[PDB]
Structures are given as C-alpha cells and as structure tokens.
Subunit: 425 residues, 4 copies
C-alpha cells in the first residue's frame, strides 16, 4: 500500500524499535528525511542580514522569525529592519508556494532594580510597530514578566512574551517564570557566565523538558553555529549541538552573530535547516508520545482532548498532515505539544496568529484572506480545502494520503472538538 | 469530587506497576461503570417460561443459547418464541429496551470427519428462525468453519460464526480457525477431557489473548458457577473463575446447566453480573491499553483510525461513554478492541446488529425505531440524542459528563470517520 | 532472537520449547498470553507448596506415605474438630510416614506440621480453648500456627504470648476471614510471619463477588513484603466425591499460583474426601503448569523496582544471586541457612531456579515449605573441624542431592549462596559453579 | 543531603521526561569521573613538567598522532610521558597509570601502507598499549593491523577508527574483530554530510554499548579552546552529549597537541564529564542493557551482572575486582554501574588498558606476596579498600561489592561478596 521504500526513509526502522538502545542502533545515515522541517529558525537581523534582497534569500533558506536585538541600534534603525523584513516577506504574496508568514521578535536590552526606562520605551516601540514576540532579557522572577506584560501597554496584550533565562536566579525560579510566560529562551551566552560553563547543559535539558511538559515554546540560543561567523562550514561540536537541541525538545533554534554580523548568514540558516530535518526524524516518537501522554494530566477541555485524539489518529495511519482551523493559534499549539510526526497545517484568518505559531514545533501557518461565506459550515470546508490545496502545492500532500482534520462545533475561538479522518482527493 | 476517585478501583488504576495495582485493590471501592462482559444463558426447562425469561433479561442475560445437543426442532422453536415474547414485552419503552441475541449451539460432528447431516438440518433451522449466532461445535480446522458457512446458505450470510475449540487439534490449528471465524468459544468441558485437565487454563488464557489481539469476540464457557445448579450460593473457586475469565479478557461469560436445568437460573445470572462488574473495574487499563495500541498494526481504514483516536480521547477526559452510530456493528467492535473504560453505546436501526454486538465487551446496543428524517444530519443528531437520553435513563450518563461521539461523513456502512467531544446537558 | 541465539545453539531448540520459555521471552503480557503452549512441558520441580488437611481420609501411616509421595509438604491439623488425643495421633502418624524415608538423606523429604486454631468465636480476644490448643502445639513441636479470625495486630501478639518462651520458633500465619482483617491488613502483616486468605469465612463476611479482590490484594502485598501467603478453601471442592475436578476448580488453583501464592491448600478434599491422594496429585500437576506460565520478565522487574534499597548483606546477596540465576538459566540456587531466612530472601524475588536450602535445623527445613520455590535438605553430618570445610561439604551435599533428585545435570550452572562466618545473619557470598 | 547530590532526585524519576525535569544545577557530582580523557601529545604538551600537570588534570591516555613527527620524536614523547607518570610512583596508594596509544597515519589512496607497518613495529618495540587504526573500512583491515603487530604485540588493543561511509556500512563486521571503535568525526564529517554525523555517532556508540566494547568520541569537542581560555556553548554541550550517548572515552586533538590551553582543555573535559555522568538515567539504561544482553554460561559474565545488580541495591560506593587481563572489570563496566569499578591488577599493561572502559579505576598491586593464595587475595582486596579510602571513593560504613575467582589465573572469576567498610 505504501511500499518498502517508504518504510526505509525518515528513520522509520529506528522508530519501530522497542527500546531506546535499539532505536539508537537502528539510526541510519542512508535513511533520508522526508517530512518538512518542523523546528523554527530565529535569525538575528543586523548589518549582514538587513538588505531586502538578503532577507529574501534567508526566507528561502528557512528563516521563520526575525530577531531585532535592542541592545544595539536606534529606534530608526529597527523600524528600517522591520520595514525591510516586511518588504521581503510581502514580495512572495502572489505565489502561495513561496508565501510564508515571518514573525518579528523584539529582544529587549535588559535591566537594575526594575524594568529599565529604555526597555519601557523599546516595548512601546514594539507595540506601535506591531511586533509579534518579545524576548525579555534577564528574567529572574514572575514579577519581571508582569512588568514586561504591563509595558505591552493597552494595545499589546496579544504579543507573546518569551522569558530569557540568563542567570542562577532565573534557573532556580524557573517554575514561577514559566507559569506566567508564553515560552522560554535558554540564553546560554549569559547563563554560561553566571553559572559554571559545565552546568549549562543541565539547565538547557531541564528547561526544555519542563517546557515540553507545560506545552509552551522553548528556544535554544547562542553559539549554536558560532564558527560560521567567519567559516563556511561549522565544527563537529556545533552540528552536534543543533541536533541535540532538537532531540532535547526545543521548538526553536536561534542564530545570533551567525546571521547578524557573520560572513555566511544564509549558509548558517541552511545549515540549521539541514540538521533540524535530520534530528526530527531521529526522535524516538514511541517513548516520547507515551511519556507526553502519561505526564499530561487528565483534561476536560475539549481542545486538549481533541488534540491528543488527533495526534493518536495521525500516528495510527501515518497521516501526511493534521489540518487545524485556529483563530488564536491555540488549537495548533495543543496539537504541537504531543509532538506528532505529521505536519500541523494551521489555517487562520489572523495574520498575527499565523506569525506567532512559528514558536510551536511542527506548525505550518497558512493565512486565509478569502471573503467569508454566508453559511458557516461552507466557510469551514473552504478553509479545510485551502489547507489541502496548499499542502498539495507545497509537497506535504498527494491524492490518496490520509489527513486528520481538527475543527470546532461553532464559530469563535475555544470551541475545537472535532477530529475527522479524511482521504485526499 | 474526591468520592469519584475512590470508586471503580481508580486508585489501583493510577498505579505505575501491576504489583502496585494489585496492592491498591479495594473491596470498599464500588463499581460505577455498567457491566461490560456479556452473559450467555443456556435455555432449558428451568428458563423456558416467558415470565422467567423477563426476570433473566432484567438480571442481565444478553444472549440466549439453544443447545441443539438436546431437544427437537419443535422444542427449540418454542424456546425462540418464548425468548422473543419476553424480549418484546419491554419494547413499549424504547429508551430502556434491551435487545437479546439468540445463539444456536450445534450438536457437532461426533465420530464423523466433517459436517454431520443433523448439523446441516439444524443450521437451516437457525436461518429459517432468524438466529443471530452459531456456536459451531468441535471446530478442528478452517474447512469446518467454511462448511458451517456453506450450510447457512445465502440467507445466513449475516449470522456470526463463533468456533468452539474443544480438542487438541483445534488448539493447534487455532490461528487458521480464528482467521475465518467471527470469534471463539473456549469450550472447557470437552477441552478438559481431550487435553489434560491441568492444561486447560493455558489454552483458555492463550485463546483469549489471541482473540483480544485479533479484535474478535471470545467466550469463556462451562462449569463457571456449576454448584449453583443445586445450591443458592457458588463456591470460592467458582466466583474466582468468573472474575479471572473477565480479567483474562473474555468478551462473554456463559451459564449452561445453571440456567438450563438448575434451581437458580435468575440468581446465577445475577451472580455473574455482580462478579463481572467487580472484575472489570479491577482491569489494569494502563498496561492493557498500551499493549493493545502497540500490538495493533498501522491502519489506513478511517473506521479503525477514528476508533483509536476516540478511545484515546475517552481516556484523556474520563469520558462516561463513547456513543457510536453503527449499521453492521463494526464501528462499535473496533472501539471495543481497544478496551476503553468508557461504555460504547451503539445506536443502530438493525435489530440483528443490536443483538450481535453483545458478543463485544463494553458495547451497549440501543435499537433506534424511528423512520429516517429527510435531512441526514438531523437523522444523525436524533440518534445521538437517543443515545444520550437512553444513557441518562439507564445511569450511564449525568449532566456535566463528557462523551465521545463517533459518526461518519455519509449514510451507509463503512464510512465512520468523525470523533467529536461532547458535554452532557 | 539475538539475546538467546548463542544459548539456543548451545542448549538446543528443544530446551527453549519447554517450561513456557517462548512465552517467557515475550516483550508484553499480551504476547506472553498468546505464546502459552499446551505442548510446552513443565521441567522445573513444583515450587508452590501443598498444605493437606489431615482427617479420617488421610490419617493412616500408609495413606500419608502416598500423600508425601504425591506432593504434600505441610500437614494441617484443624483444631475446630477432634480432641488433643486425636491430634497427637495424627502428628505421630505423620511423623512415622515422614521418617519412613529418612534412610536415604539425599532423598528424604521433610514435612511441616501446622496447627489451625478454632478461633475466638463471639469473643473479643484469645479464647480459653485456643490458649490450651496453642500450649498443645508447643508441647508437640508444631512448626506453624494458622491463627483463625485475626482482626488486628494485638490478636497476633496474643497468639505469640500464648505460645510462650518455648514456642518462639513457631511461625504465625494470620488468617484473614472478615472485613476488619482486610481493612487492618497492613498492621497484621507487619507483626505476622505470613497470611492465609481464608476464603470460606471471608466469602460470608464480605460479598462473595468481592473475595477475589481481597485475595489478589493480600497476595500482592505479601509478595511486596516478602512474607508467605496461603490461598485456602474450596480449591478442588468437587474432588471430595468425584475423581476429576470442575473447570472452575483447576482454573482457581492455577490462578492462585499465577496471583503469587506461596502455598495452596486442601481442606475436605484430603480430610474427608474419597480421593485425598488424587487431590494432592491434581494440585501438584496444576501448580507445575501455572509456575511455568508466570511472566517472570515483568514480575522480576516489578519486584526489583518495588523493593526499597537495602544495606542488609543477606538482602543484597539474594537479589544478586537471583539476577545471576536468570542470566545463565541456572538449574538451582543452593543456599546454606540456619533459620531459613537466606532462602526466604531469595524466594521473594521469585526466581525460576529452584532454591535448594541446606540446613542442620529440622524445624527450619520443615518451615521453609511456606516459601515458594524453596526445596529443603536436612544435613545430618556432625560438624567438621575447619568451618570452611564444613561449609564446602554442605554445598557438595546440595549438589549431590540435586543430581540424585534430577534438579541438576552435568554442564548445568548453579548459584551458591553462603556467609563469611558461622551463625545466622551473615550471608554475603554468591558463587557461580559449573556442574561436573 | 546524600539524596540531593549526584542528580539522585532525577535518577529516581519514573519517566525520562520527569528525569530531565528534575535535573538540578545545584546537585553536585560526588562520584569520580568515569569517562576517560585521551589527550593528543604535541608541541604544547610534550615537556615532562607539562605532562605532570595534564596527569593531575585528568589525562588517562596519551595519543601519539603518527600522521606528523618522526620515530625519534615519538620515542621522546613516550619517554617524557613515562617519566611524568613514574614521578608519582612513590605513593602506590595514589599512583595513576597512563596508557599510551599510537594513532596510525592510515592507508591514504592505497591496504596497510608501508609506513603503517613500520609505525606498528615501532609501537610493539616501545610497548604501546593501544593502536587507533586509521580509516578502517572492513574486517580485513583490522586483521592486517593485527598481523603487523606480530606475535610480540598480541596484547595491544586495536581501536578501529570509523572515518568514512564504507566503515559506517560495514560497522558490524569491523566491531566483531576489533577491541573497540573510535568515532573519527573529522574525516567522517567530510566523507558523509555534516548533518548526518550525529546519527553515525549515536548508532556506533549504541552498538558498542550493546557489544560491551569501548567506544571513543573524537574531534572538535572543545576546538575553540586551541586559542581561547573558555569553550563555546556548543562545545560544552557536545562533550556532555557524547558522555550521555554512552562514550567510554572522550578525546582532545589540537586542543592539547598545539593549543594555548592544553591543561585547561583537560580540566574542562573532566568537569563536563563528571556533570554528564551524574545526569545519566540509570533506571532505563540498566534495564535496557540487562534486557539486551544475551543469556550467558560464562561465570565471569554471570558474576558481573549479579555484582552490578547488588551494587545498585545497596548504593555501593565501589565494586572492587581482581583482574589479570582487565576482562572481569570490562564485563562489570558494560552494565554501566553508578558504583566505581576499582580494578586491582598486577599487570601494568592491563592497568593502562582498562582506561578504555568507562568507570574502571585501575590500581597496580606492588605489595609483597602472601604465601597462602587466599591471603594474597584478601590482601589485594584490602589494597583496593585502602587506595579507595585515600582517594575519596570509600568511607567507613560504606558497602562494597568484591568480585574474585575460585583459583589463580585469568578466566576463573565467579565470586561476589557484600562487604562493609571498616
Ligand atoms: O506475571 S506478572 O508479571 N504480570 C502479569 C499479570 C497481569 C495481568 C493483567 C494485566 S492487564 O494489564 O490487565 C492486561 C494486559 C494485557 C493483556 C491482558 O489480557 C491483560 C497485566 C499484568 C506478575 C504477577 C503477579 C504480580 O504480583 C506482579 O507484580 C506481576
Ligand atoms: O525521544 S525520546 O523518547 N528520547 C529518549 C532519550 C533518552 C536518552 C537517554 C536515556 S538513558 O536511559 O540514559 C539511555 C538508555 C539506553 C541507551 C542509552 O545510550 C542511554 C533514555 C532516553 C524523549 C525525548 C525527550 C523527552 O523529553 C522525552 O520524554 C523522551
Ligand atoms: O485555536 P482557537 O483559537 O481556539 O480557534 C479554534 C476555532 O476555530 C474554529 O474551528 C473555526 O472558527 P471560526 O469560524 O470563527 O474561524 C472554531 O470552531 C474553533 O473554536
Ligand atoms: O459500523 P458501520 O456498520 O460501518 O456503520 C457506520 C455508519 O453509520 C453512520 O454513522 C450513519 O449511517 P446511516 O445514516 O446509514 O445509519 C455512517 O455515516 C457510517 O458509515
Ligand atoms: O539464613 P540464616 O538463618 O541467616 O543462616 C545463614 C548462615 O549460614 C551460614 O552460611 C553457615 O553458618 P553455620 O556454620 O552456622 O551453619 C552462615 O555463614 C550464614 O550466616
Ligand atoms: O579478569 P581476569 O583476567 O579473567 O582475571 C580474574 C582472575 O583474578 C583472580 O581473582 C585472582 O587471580 P591471581 O591470583 O592469578 O591474580 C582469579 O581468581 C580470576 O580468575
Ligand atoms: O541574550 C542572549 O541571547 C544570551 O545571553 O545568550
Ligand atoms: O460445548 C461446550 O460448552 C463444552 O464442550 O464445554
Ligand atoms: O478457616 C478457613 O480456612 C476459612 O474460613 O476458609
Ligand atoms: O583521525 C581522526 O580522529 C579524525 O579524522 O577525526
Ligand atoms: K538583547
Ligand atoms: K452442543
Ligand atoms: K478452624
Ligand atoms: K592518524
Ligand atoms: Mg543575554
Ligand atoms: Mg462440548
Ligand atoms: Mg474459617
Ligand atoms: Mg582522521
């Protein structure tokens, strides 16, 4: 029905293994990855990656989120970076095969006894310029997150706050920080100076694990492909680090100086893309899914209940994709927390939600711009078919494939409760 | 509530090991779920009366067995009529009507190699009188099942064939017999004479395990409550035997002389009901569900894919029930094979399918009598509501419960593909 | 297949078809059930002990010799019936039949004698008759007391007090026969040597459909605690009058063994029934089949995970020895024991290898029948001058008895468990020996 | 306090997810560092005084890269290593043996090159303990190296370097005839796509752990430390992940051979390895190793598993084993105990070679012999206890597992004892 060749690709022999030891033993360098790359790439924008033409190359290479480091540059400089990013993104708004939404993240300068005057001003700039994410520097306690939240003024409550853990206090107060944050960034640069360098891997693995348990995005950052700032190829330790961040459970991987000031920004994005695809296929879904399953508490929220049912159904038939209709991105996030091997194609009318779902591993956003149908059920089918036709166009789907479709019983956010098994025609 | 988590062996169900599970079993933890293992009662002089059969239906009898080793065709036609009269005496209240299957147990081949002439005549009698199941005696090979199928003719295509394994050859050729049969009966009486008495438990446990693996019904039969033929209470070995047949994985438990000729046919049914409810709550679903999921192969059939997604969703929210619309009973059978703790309420218009789904553990058949609505989505909703109303009346559901609703995308058998999370109002 | 491939080439394909070995290699319990084979013959010696109640049907010395040969390990004296004179005669007849085989020490089979008390009845504590019967047991050298209707830890303390200073070595097995005993189980097990699931009274005190929950819970907790547990009453009830049992009865025996019971009992089946020897033979046949059907892969891991860390060298050596025995498919584990404790600690990890316990204590040899898989050997030789040579003679005695009885063959591996100095409590050594 | 150290809360976890969640940066490692450090000897690490600092820092194996330097140069390196090692022999209870490994130049465009035949004969003549055979592609390559060592080099360990696609594809046949493997990531990263090397590393480490044979992770582990005093975040992560993968040895090439911070690179590998070893999820690892290991009728193999099981049961501080060839210690090591495997040996070569096995701490027995063999055994067991106490492995009140044999000579290990310290 699928062929012997299908079961030799994307580490399927290693995925069938009964133990983790057998899984490692069955990893094959000749087993090619087939699924789309699911770990998002955050690229820091700087002199090496600011031009509209250079940004088009980086979008094509795999950049999903553009990071603006507010430790350097003026508001005028960053507004120009935003405009250049938006111009390069909208240059693909014709052909859907190349049109991909790109998120814009503001990385704050940091504190000091409270939120800094500069941080308050930069956060206000982010709201005024419609940024999607804030990477809040040096978060030490829950009250730091609340201060950043307060600063996202009256109009920026939809912006996602990703708290950067950069010191011992942040590591120790992690649970209270994650509870009030949208996600976490393992800011290894400062963390490696604040705590012993040989202890950073424990902090990374712990934080990634707790974020996977909570179902919140986690970013692995700093010195991932450091040598690529000057050299065209990375070291053996660097490719290993990227692969292990993906295997650890990181939703996003980041490039700092590699894309901001280095000689090979596009090549660094291409390298992260190549390694992430390989590492995602090497994930031991058998144990991962059962552990996520057992660790997740019982839920009476129909979205959460539908998400696990959909991911279970996708594994049962080797579904090509899970197509989900989402207004805020939440239904796609709850599918993503169970780490399916199937791509989560999220169809949304919210341009912000389409940009923000790049924070979640395996979510492929589609922005729907069609005029609404008079009958709601008709409008729902039109978006499901949009997901299928885009999936076909991009290579995710083919006729005869099975897809899982996640929808809700009534319009508006918060009513996801339906899972359909559909044959692609 | 705290009280909810003390009932139906919920502390023992949360255990991380089978040893801890046994240690947490509580005699004060009352069973809450409806009894899911079916009771087959053999009809005879002690249970032939229409008034006596009404008491047995109320006590829990799901399948009426006609032993064709005794009695004439005239005798068995009268048994069938009395059963049908007692069953239809409750059809005035459709929300509480309980369907009862009629099974013909053949006399067997005796000294002969193949299908006896009496068996051919009895099988044609069964087709003419509309029996739902055939318990084919002394099945030794796949060709014996084919001969029974041939004797049933074109009109008996819908009758279910449950092969009785009564000797060493049947045990050795088990796989080929199960492949062509609808299910199996562990006929312990003859099996205990054909093979050493001390080896029968190995044959019972093996056959039950293989039927659970295959997703096909398995009946445990003979001497389960033997002492209740003359005594009002069973022995300690007898209650233990019933409990262990349920814990082994048997879909059905049987009463022979206990209901056919004894002095306690109603009490024997009540006893089997009481023990089965206790034993079903003591099932270690944590290990069982994982093992059934792991052992079940990948499938591209949307009914099979929806079934596993629905059972996974039911466990996630502690769903009170899984309401399924079924024409042939197949959708209910595929839900049943994953052994959910949630009751599988099967709503059907087929009176034969409603009788035959009693062969599957945890399937509660509801016969829907209304003629089809003009709008198909309205006819579907009306059936789902009938399942909710019946389930509320019978104690399966209460307001505030979560239920998983399993339906299809078009009318007719074979199109189940939808799973939706519903809240009882 | 790679985890057995070499041992398969060495021991042969036939070895791996016997004693439910394909079912034992299974990765899941479902696969284990699926692989159970009626043609896979049991090879190991029967490890669950058989307790036979002595009565009119089983009192003659000649009848008792047949029952010893059939598999009876413990003789139960029901003090609810019969006088002290009657029970002293039963004891004498049992001892006469047991000692009739003492001529060959390499094949002698010890038999324990257990006194089952009448109980408190309407009373709150120890009855006057129980005090008199317990005093009789001490005077007649009984090995075990099955204390009727134990409801709390103070009941077991009263039985211990009644046994006095001379009955300190007697094992107290508390009978759980009512709701209070089930609810206060943990405190009762803590102060008892073991438990008996007295299903007859328990089935009247609590709903009959709840007894299996009580049986499975108590057996599980006793397995967790490492203390003996007996399953009792109506196991082969129909065999009192019929030569073959019902399908529910064989199932019940098999399931008590599969549950984790150390001992299985016969009451009326041997005390008054027409087939006492046939009932013992039936329990023996079913137990041997059920023991091979145990899913040791999950059982050993669960016992291992549930057992807390220990700093007692006997406990540490016991787990190391059972692990070593599973690694090489050891035919037996030979252990030197004074009180039976080292053998009991090996037994709690439920090895598939027979635990051959070599002891000089005739009482310990009788009492280790309470522990599943322990095969007692009574050493009658006087002590050697060098202790290190006395120990080596006791190990060789175990190897010779094991060879003589069919437990060991040339080429087999055996695990030997000993201590560093004489006296009880110093077990700390494990050795891997090849049988020549 | 004992249960808060060495990631013990994370070790008690019922799932790997819970294990990651419980990892604590404040939980200090207490056990001795188990993963051996191989340091490449070069201009930056050749002086006797420099080598004493590297021995003190944690270097267990000295690698001589025969791709550069003459036989005269390498003989001087060997002499300087031996001089620095023997400078600590005055205190036998604290003396640390150091192995010497010859890394061959390789076949290049060619079977076994003429230079390799000459270098292998040099190794035999100079008493090297290990050979890291470059570019092994098939079992016949290993046989050729074995032949070039001759009858005088029967005891040298051959660690095959997997550096290309053919070596990865023919891995099983190479491991079968080799003593161990080296994941030579430098050449492997050029021969196969750079993004596929982690799959080859994890597969080879897993198969070596399965086989019970040593596996070395090599190349660019702390590369930036050649010029900088601190490594990158990717580098510390790489070292930690090689240990977490199951590597018996970790290597330093340019970092120690030509770099500005050779001692600091050794100290860094030591610090990371200790942290990573405590973060190992022994609950799942031991079970998987147990299940995957086949049934055995060799009493050494049977005693090894029984001893590791007993060590976990009592939280044994160490497993003291008497070994002639190092085999009994290797069979204990394959089950990855948390307890240190203190191997007491009279063979100086076996003491150097057991560094290839993770968690084996070699002690050279140089005390006078007892007339009664039973007394000679108990004295060697007391030697292990005294060296253990002095080095911090043992304290009074600890439990130890002692592994011995029934008769003198190699191949007779069959006894395990539970002993209380003092
Ligand atoms: O032998 S054992 O290793 N376990 C096996 C017993 C058992 C029974 C039932 C289930 S089920 O998860 O309900 C289930 C699963 C699959 C198929 C199925 O039909 C049922 C699981 C396990 C053992 C015995 C005693 C013990 O006291 C112990 O700790 C371990
Ligand atoms: O996809 S996973 O299932 N990877 C399992 C990862 C893992 C790693 C190490 C060990 S080991 O027990 O130390 C060991 C055992 C055997 C061989 C060995 O060399 C090591 C066990 C498990 C997963 C990822 C992220 C998670 O957050 C999660 O919950 C599950
Ligand atoms: O993920 P979110 O934000 O909860 O959105 C999911 C919602 O999308 C839908 O599928 C479609 O809703 P709309 O028609 O309003 O877009 C709803 O039925 C469901 O509640
Ligand atoms: O279990 P079966 O026999 O395949 O029946 C399931 C069928 O029932 C339905 O839910 C309802 O169908 P009907 O309207 O014909 O009753 C179908 O959509 C589905 O195909
Ligand atoms: O099982 P127990 O009662 O602790 O007895 C085990 C004892 O038996 C021995 O192996 C032999 O001791 P004895 O010389 O007293 O018979 C002791 O070394 C050990 O302490
Ligand atoms: O690990 P190896 O090489 O097999 O050596 C283990 C050997 O060491 C001993 O424990 C002590 O032997 P020696 O007295 O010859 O040193 C032997 O009994 C055992 O056979
Ligand atoms: O700010 C950061 O990215 C860091 O500190 O690693
Ligand atoms: O037919 C039966 O029921 C039997 O033989 O047990
Ligand atoms: O006393 C007993 O043995 C009983 O009640 O079962
Ligand atoms: O020779 C090596 O070690 C390499 O190339 O990595
Ligand atoms: K910044
Ligand atoms: K019949
Ligand atoms: K009594
Ligand atoms: K080289
Ligand atoms: Mg920073
Ligand atoms: Mg029959
Ligand atoms: Mg009683
Ligand atoms: Mg190289």
């Amino acid at each position: 029905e699928l062929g012997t060749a299908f079961f030799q690709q994307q580490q399927l022999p290693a995925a069938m293994a009964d133990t983790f030891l057998e899984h490692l033993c069955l990893l094959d360098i000749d087993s090619e990855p087939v699924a789309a790359r699911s770990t998002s790439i955050i690229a820091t924008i700087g002199p090496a990656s600011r031009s509209v033409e250079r940004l088009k190359e980086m979008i094509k290479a795999g950049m999903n989120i553009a990071r603006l480091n507010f430790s350097h540059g003026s508001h005028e400089y960053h507004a120009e970076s935003i405009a250049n990013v938006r111009e390069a993104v909208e240059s693909f708004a014709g052909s859907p095969l190349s049109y991909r939404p790109v998120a814009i993240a503001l990385d704050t300068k940091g504190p000091g006894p409270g939120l800094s005057e500069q941080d308050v001003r930069d956060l206000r700039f982010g709201v005024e310029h419609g940024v999607d994410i804030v990477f809040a520097s040096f978060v030490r306690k829950a009250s730091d997150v609340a201060a950043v939240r307060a600063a996202l003024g009256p109009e920026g409550h939809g912006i996602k706050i990703i708290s950067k853990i950069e010191n011992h206090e942040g590591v120790k107060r992690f649970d209270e920080i994650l509870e009030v944050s949208d996600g976490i960034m393992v800011a290894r640069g400062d963390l490696g100076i604040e705590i012993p360098a040989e202890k950073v891997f424990l902090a990374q693995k712990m934080m990634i694990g707790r974020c996977n348990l909570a179902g919140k995005p986690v970013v692995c950052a700093t010195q991932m492909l450091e040598s690529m700032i000057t050299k065209p190829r990375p070291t053996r330790a660097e490719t290993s680090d990227v692969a292990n961040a993906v295997l650890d459970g990181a939703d996003c991987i980041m490039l700092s100086g590699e894309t901001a000031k280095g000689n090979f920004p596009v090549e660094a994005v291409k390298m992260q893309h190549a390694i992430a695809r390989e590492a995602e296929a090497a994930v031991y879904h058998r144990q991962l899914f059962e552990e996520l399953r057992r660790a997740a508490p019982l839920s009476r929220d129909p979205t959460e209940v539908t998400a696990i049912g959909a991911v279970e159904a996708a594994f049962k038939c080797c579904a090509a994709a899970i197509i989900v209709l989402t207004t805020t991105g939440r239904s796609a996030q709850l599918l993503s927390r169970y780490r399916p091997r199937a791509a989560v194609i999220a169809v949304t009318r919210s341009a912000q939600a389409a940009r923000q779902v790049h924070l979640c591993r395996g979510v492929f956003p589609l922005l729907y711009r069609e005029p609404p149908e008079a009958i709601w059920a008709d409008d729902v089918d039109r978006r499901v078919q949009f997901g299928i036709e885009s999936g076909k166009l991009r290579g995710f789907l083919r006729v005869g494939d099975l897809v899982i479709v996640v929808t809700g019983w009534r319009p508006g956010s918060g009513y996801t409760n339906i899972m359909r098994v559909l044959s692609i025609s």
